[PDB]
Amino acid sequence: GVGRLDDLKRSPLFQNVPEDAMREALKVVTERNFQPDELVVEQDAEGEALHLVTTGVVRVSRVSLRERVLGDIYAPGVVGETAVLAHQERSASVRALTPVRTLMLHREHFELILRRHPRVLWNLAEMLARRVTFLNDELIAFGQNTEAALTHVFANLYRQRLAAGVPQPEVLPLGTQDIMARTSSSRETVSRVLKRLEAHNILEVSPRSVTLLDLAALEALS
Amino acid sequence: GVGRLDDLKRSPLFQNVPEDAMREALKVVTERNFQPDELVVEQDAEGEALHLVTTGVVRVSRVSLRERVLGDIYAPGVVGETAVLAHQERSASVRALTPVRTLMLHREHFELILRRHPRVLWNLAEMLARRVTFLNDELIAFGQNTEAALTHVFANLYRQRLAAGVPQPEVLPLGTQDIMARTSSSRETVSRVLKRLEAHNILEVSPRSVTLLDLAALEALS
Numbered sequence A, B: 001g002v003g004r005l006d007d008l009k010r011s012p013l014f015q016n017v018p019e020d021a022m023r024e025a026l027k028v029v030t031e032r033n034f035q036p037d038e039l040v041v042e043q044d045a046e047g048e049a050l051h052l053v054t055t056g057v058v059r060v061s062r063v064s065l066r067e068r069v070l071g072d073i074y075a076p077g078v079v080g081e082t083a084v085l086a087h088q089e090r091s092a093s094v095r096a097l098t099p100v101r102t103l104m105l106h107r108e109h110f111e112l113i114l115r116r117h118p119r120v121l122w123n124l125a126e127m128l129a130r131r132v133t134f135l136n137d138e139l140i141a142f143g144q145n146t147e148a149a150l151t152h153v154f155a156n157l158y159r160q161r162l163a164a165g166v167p168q169p170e171v172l173p174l175g176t177q178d179i180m181a182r183t184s185s186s187r188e189t190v191s192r193v194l195k196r197l198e199a200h201n202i203l204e205v206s207p208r209s210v211t212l213l214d215l216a217a218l219e220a221l222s
Helices: A007-010 A019-027 A106-117 A116-145 A144-166 A175-183 A185-197 A215-220 B004-010 B019-026 B107-116 B119-142 B146-164 B176-183 B189-199 B217-219
Strands: A029-034 A050-053 A059-062 A067-074 A075-079 A092-096 A101-107 A203-206 A211-212 B029-034 B050-053 B056-065 B067-074 B077-079 B092-096 B101-104 B203-206 B209-212
Touching: A007 A019, A007 A101, A007 B077, A019 A029, A019 A106, A029 B146, A050 B146, A059 B176, A067 A075, A067 A101, A067 A144, A067 A175, A067 B119, A075 B101, A075 B203, A092 B146, A106 A116, A116 B067, A116 B119, A144 A175, A144 A211, A144 A215, A175 A185, A211 B067, B004 B019, B004 B029, B019 B029, B019 B107, B067 B077, B067 B146, B067 B176, B092 B119, B107 B119, B119 B146, B146 B176, B146 B189, B146 B217, B176 B189, B189 B203
Parallel strands: none
Antiparallel strands: A029 A101, A050 A075, A050 A101, A059 A067, A059 A092, A203 A211, B029 B101, B050 B077, B050 B101, B056 B067, B056 B092, B203 B209
């Protein structure tokens, strides 16, 4: 369906923002639907437009001229927001993992809303600050060892799944290939680490998922 | 000396901000000076206070309960700004590399300035967005290979030194240990990569520095 105020009320960008800001945004958004495996993009506004992710899950990646997956975004979420502020542009790919409904906002309109409604800008700054903190944590983890890398990835994906209210959040939809692409770790080291965690009753490894049994034990074991 | 309007005019946080915003800030900052190797911190406001770095260079690190150096910040710069927005707190260390003069601002005062003067908040959001882009680039580089890691570190540190207007910006003040701490790479791989770059006339390696001879060749060779 067309954009509703409900969509914006639930968006991290519009938390505790005045109703008139949300209604101004609604006049300039366009509903866009994507099926599993389709790229989230607006033709003729590649790398520019913002998408409020209202349902579903998307995967964000950067592919070399080999894909490194940066992470997933569960509804309610946002993609393309780091561009209205950083004029810097890079070959990012956003692919729907499930059916996904978005509200597309062009850069010029998002800029106007930010300038006119400081509470929306405050929400964006908070989101960006959390992303910086997260990425510093990620760099620390990945620079340590595969064990630290997996703990970082699993604990944070679990928290995202809890926040999204999805069924079976503890059943992380990652296979060995997914883990390697998300962490840049070898099959040998990923396998070794997963077997030791399964041996300590911290998790259960299936071909298409990792089931977290004891989060506290995973995070403690560091 | 006590805070001057000159300090704020040059700060990334106050670019194109109205004069009255800067004068409001000046009423609530405190000059703090640090000598080489001293920790930049305000006693009783550990992890809270913001510091505008007006002269010198600081190094930012996270030390485990082993130090991973996140990077350096050249004046005019800022430290502690990702906290007024992310209530998340972590054991970061900021150490002066040279003599450093700062203007300290308490969190509550920085929050007030941000709420009252949206242009300062816009500057912060831009800074954070650039940091996210940079950290994504860093994760991509470090996940590839030591060669990509060194190119990322060297090109970006050179740009920082150019921006800071320091003498001999091409003479990067990094030894092998510094490079290992900044990238989490082994001595063997760092040594191998540096010798091949020196062999291609891309740089010159000294015990306490790496002199960049051909930036374009370093970045091209990827």
